[PDB]
Amino acid sequence: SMSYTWTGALITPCAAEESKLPINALSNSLLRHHNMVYATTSRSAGLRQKKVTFDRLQVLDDHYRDVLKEMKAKASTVKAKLLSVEEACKLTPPHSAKSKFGYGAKDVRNLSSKAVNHIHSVWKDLLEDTVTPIDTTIMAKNEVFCVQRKPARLIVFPDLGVRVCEKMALYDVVSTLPQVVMGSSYGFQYSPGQRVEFLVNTWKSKKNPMGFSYDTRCFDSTVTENDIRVEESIYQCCDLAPEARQAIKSLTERLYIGGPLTNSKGQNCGYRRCRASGVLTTSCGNTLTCYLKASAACRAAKLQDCTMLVNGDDLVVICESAGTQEDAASLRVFTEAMTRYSAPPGDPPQPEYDLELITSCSSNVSVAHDASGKRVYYLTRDPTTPLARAAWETARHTPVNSWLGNIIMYAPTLWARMILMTHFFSILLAQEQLEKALDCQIYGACYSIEPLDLPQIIERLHGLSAFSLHSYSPGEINRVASCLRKLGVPPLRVWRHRARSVRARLLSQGGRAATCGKYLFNWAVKTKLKLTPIPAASQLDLSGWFVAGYSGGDIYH
Numbered sequence: 001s002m003s004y005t006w007t008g009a010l011i012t013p014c015a016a017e018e019s020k021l022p023i024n025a026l027s028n029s030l031l032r033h034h035n036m037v038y039a040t041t042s043r044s045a046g047l048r049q050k051k052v053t054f055d056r057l058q059v060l061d062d063h064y065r066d067v068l069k070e071m072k073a074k075a076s077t078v079k080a081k082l083l084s085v086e087e088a089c090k091l092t093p094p095h096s097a098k099s100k101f102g103y104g105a106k107d108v109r110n111l112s113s114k115a116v117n118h119i120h121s122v123w124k125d126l127l128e129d130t131v132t133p134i135d136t137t138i139m140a141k142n143e144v145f146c147v148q149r150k151p152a153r154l155i156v157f158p159d160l161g162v163r164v165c166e167k168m169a170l171y172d173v174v175s176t177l178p179q180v181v182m183g184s185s186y187g188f189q190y191s192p193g194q195r196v197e198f199l200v201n202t203w204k205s206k207k208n209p210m211g212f213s214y215d216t217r218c219f220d221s222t223v224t225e226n227d228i229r230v231e232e233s234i235y236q237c238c239d240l241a242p243e244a245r246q247a248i249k250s251l252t253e254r255l256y257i258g259g260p261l262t263n264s265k266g267q268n269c270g271y272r273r274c275r276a277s278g279v280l281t282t283s284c285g286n287t288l289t290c291y292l293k294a295s296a297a298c299r300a301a302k303l304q305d306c307t308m309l310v311n312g313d314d315l316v317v318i319c320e321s322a323g324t325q326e327d328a329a330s331l332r333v334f335t336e337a338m339t340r341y342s343a344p345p346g347d348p349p350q351p352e353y354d355l356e357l358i359t360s361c362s363s364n365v366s367v368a369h370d371a372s373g374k375r376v377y378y379l380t381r382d383p384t385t386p387l388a389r390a391a392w393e394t395a396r397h398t399p400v401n402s403w404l405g406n407i408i409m410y411a412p413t414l415w416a417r418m419i420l421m422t423h424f425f426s427i428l429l430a431q432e433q434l435e436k437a438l439d440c441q442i443y444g445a446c447y448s449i450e451p452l453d454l455p456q457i458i459e460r461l462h463g464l465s466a467f468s469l470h471s472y473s474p475g476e477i478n479r480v481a482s483c484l485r486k487l488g489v490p491p492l493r494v495w496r497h498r499a500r501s502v503r504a505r506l507l508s509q510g511g512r513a514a515t516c517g518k519y520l521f522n523w524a525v526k527t528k529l530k531l532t533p534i535p536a537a538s539q540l541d542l543s544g545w546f547v548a549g550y551s552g553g554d555i556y557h
């Protein structure tokens with residue numbers, strides 16, 4: 001069937017959009033080639049509409065059905081609980097798009113009677129109606145990039161009332177079933193250090209390791225009604241409260257499978273017959289689907305001893321090599337299978353025999369050295385998009401602080417430490433806003449974070465060695481330096497000098513701000529210290545931090 005049908009109504013913005021990088025007094029201190037940075041807007045939504053619209057055909061064979069039978073057997077061991085309206089409400093972001101029924105996100109979180117009364121009747125309607133398609137809003141994402149211009153990603157999402165109900169019925173399933181079904185292959189269960197650990201141990205576990213990533217063209221569009229149905233049969237394998245089963249079935253038939261698309265102005269835009277990107281189960285269902293197709297494709301291509309790592313639509317496979325040219329032929333057979341399954345490639349997969357050349361979740365493993373000269377593997381990425389985004393956040397306050405999220409995910413990296421930490425801690429000092437909490441996303445879920453808790457969070461996540469890394473690899477140092485040339489970012493030498501200043505200004509304030517100077521910026525001094533564990537770090541509730549993915553999922557912690 002066609003992934004989408006369109007009436008020709010435009011996808012409309014909910015407010016004023018900017019596409020050129022706003023500039024302020026701080027802008028040039030970070031990035032000077034302002035014209036290489038842009039933000040996607042709703043002005044380009046029509047090209048994405050063309051791009052995500054095509055016919056899917058699926059040919060499902062025994063390898064496909066065998067794997068599914070395996071996954072369901074695992075799924076059968078999962079017990080999930082219904083969440084209460086109250087529990088579901090506190091998972092709602094403070095800033096989540098308001099209902100069309102006279103209440104917003106803060107209404108939800110306060111368990112206000114208007115919100116709770118509406119939520120109860122959506123629930124009841126779900127239990128009493130398994131047919132009537134549920135309405136969705138279609139919007140264009142404003143995301144910041146660097147000239148390669150990409151058209152805007154789209155977001156399709158049901159009303160605030162449906163979204164609370166979704167959590168009641170499926171929050172516990174989507175958090176817990178994926179690890180049980182996919183085991184160590186489920187990606188969102190790992191912190192960045194645990195991901196590096198798994199990749200390395202896996203690579204080492206092969207007699208002759210080969211690895212490749214597989215990038216599907218517009219994954220959401222390739223998801224068919226069969227797929228969304230298949231993943232419901234997985235869910236329904238769980239031990240469930242009868243109200244949960246009924247609601248999951250209802251949400252599957254009415255919403256997950258398909259539904260009408262309405263713009264921010266109230267006009268019908270068309271019909272969806274593929275994955276909606278703004279539903280709770282988006283991440284879990286894409287992960288499951290990508291894992292089923294790929295697993296099944298590993299058998300068609302007779303790839304030997306595969307260890308897959310899947311995060312939504314993002315897939316890396318590490319297997320036993322069969323010889324370079326035979327690996328090349330293998331992957332072509334992998335791709336013909338994936339294609340039959342309705343998941344053809346963007347870029348054709350390539351075999352890699354150097355772990356550090358594999359990109360997965362936009363990231364690669366690299367090596368540096370700790371205080372003792374020990375080799376230590378860490379996760380990193382091309383800093384271009386991080387830097388483009390930080391330029392923007394340098395002038396405009398945004399719903400998500402990518403700089404903050406990147407500091408946490410890439411704390412051990414050359415670029416996060418030397419540039420991101422230096423830049424934004426300088427900004428925060430001048431506004432006296434270190435204790436002001438800021439929203440970032442980690443694995444698609446929203447978190448409110450104090451810049452001041454950074455060294456404690458970084459210690460827990462990556463360990464004290466993130467504050468001591470040095471002697472980075474030549475390829476990593478070159479990729480960073482070269483990105484800086486491209487973007488017009490001061491060279492790493494300038495950052496070091498600025499950081500001695502930021503460090504000094506931080507220690508001057510004493511307390512936690514000083515701990516920030518001490519731990520985050522110890523790399524910037526000759527008279528560097530011994531970094532002992534932070535006392536208050538065990539008091540942090542880092543439970544629930546790397547357990548599941550919830551992108552599109554409207555989840556707050």
Ligand SMILES: CC(C)CCn1nc(-c2cncs2)c(O)c(C2=Nc3ccc(OCC(N)=O)cc3S(=O)(=O)N2)c1=O
Nearest residue numbers: 192283311312313361405406409441442443444549551
């Ligand atoms: C694997 C990590 C250790 C490093 C890279 N990284 N980084 C982040 C960051 C979050 N804030 C700053 S960076 C982050 O939130 C994610 C991340 N990974 C996803 C991957 C694939 C995804 O697929 C979406 C779908 N197809 O439905 C979704 C995500 S995510 O959960 O939004 N967040 C991520 O993978």
